[PDB]
């Protein structure tokens, strides 16, 4: 069994619908639902948590005055079920704020650290879905990376656009986020780590690998 956190950006920018028929929020929710359905129908023993960032309310163990705001643990590290499918389909809505993705990463890491205690997993995994529109702080990022390595956590980033035809009108903040993702993945896995950065279009199959 593996332990997976789906770390999903639900911030306001994700709701903007200007590519195809679905906004990035709708696309990411669909992938999440299809993945969870696959896991349920297959009777997989993997445990799957869901952390949302950009939520209007805050609900996580690290939250305090000005810390880890607008990040919510929607599902703890457990086998998935149909209640979760129903819960995600009808509850998970776009947020009206933005949040710091490295705060969300830390919340996800803390969730794994606590809830895998004393148990054996084949891998620990965090999959981030985001358009990288939100600002973030790099404070103590070197410690985040050190702890990702120590815990042997694998990281995947999924974006609603390619980062390799016409340019796609990415903001400076999105370009900064892309570069930071590249810095993190290179820090974890060198050149091979940069290959762990994917599109929403490819995300469902890359999760199942």
């Amino acid at each position: 069994k593996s332990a997976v956190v789906l770390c999903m950006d639900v911030g306001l920018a994700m709701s903007h619908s200007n590519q195809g028929k679905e906004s990035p929020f709708e696309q990411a929710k669909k992938v999440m639902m299809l993945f969870l359905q696959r896991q349920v129908f297959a009777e997989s023993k993997d445990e799957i948590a869901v952390v949302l960032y950009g939520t209007d309310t805050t609900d996580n163990a690290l939250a305090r005055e000005d810390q880890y705001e607008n990040i919510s643990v929607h599902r703890h590290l457990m086998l998935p079920d149909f209640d979760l499918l129903e819960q995600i389909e009808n509850v998970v809505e776009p947020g009206s704020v933005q949040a710091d993705f490295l705060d969300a990463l830390i919340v996800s890491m803390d969730l794994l650290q606590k809830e895998t205690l004393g148990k054996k997993y084949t891998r620990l995994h965090i999959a981030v879905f985001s358009d990288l529109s939100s600002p973030f702080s790099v404070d103590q990022l070197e410690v985040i990376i050190a702890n990702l390595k120590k815990a042997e956590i694998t990281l995947q980033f999924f974006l609603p656009f390619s980062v390799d035809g016409p340019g796609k009108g990415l903001s400076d903040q999105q370009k900064e986020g892309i570069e930071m993702v590249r810095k993190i993945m290179f820090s974890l896995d060198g050149e091979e780590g940069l290959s762990e950065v994917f599109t929403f279009r490819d995300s469902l199959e890359r999760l199942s690998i």
């Binding site: 830390i106 803390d110 650290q113």
Partner: peptide, 12 residues
């Protein structure tokens, strides 16, 4: 830069 406070286990 905005300072964050990491959980104690990360600072071990």
């Amino acid at each position: 830069e905005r300072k964050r406070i990491l959980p104690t286990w990360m600072l071990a």
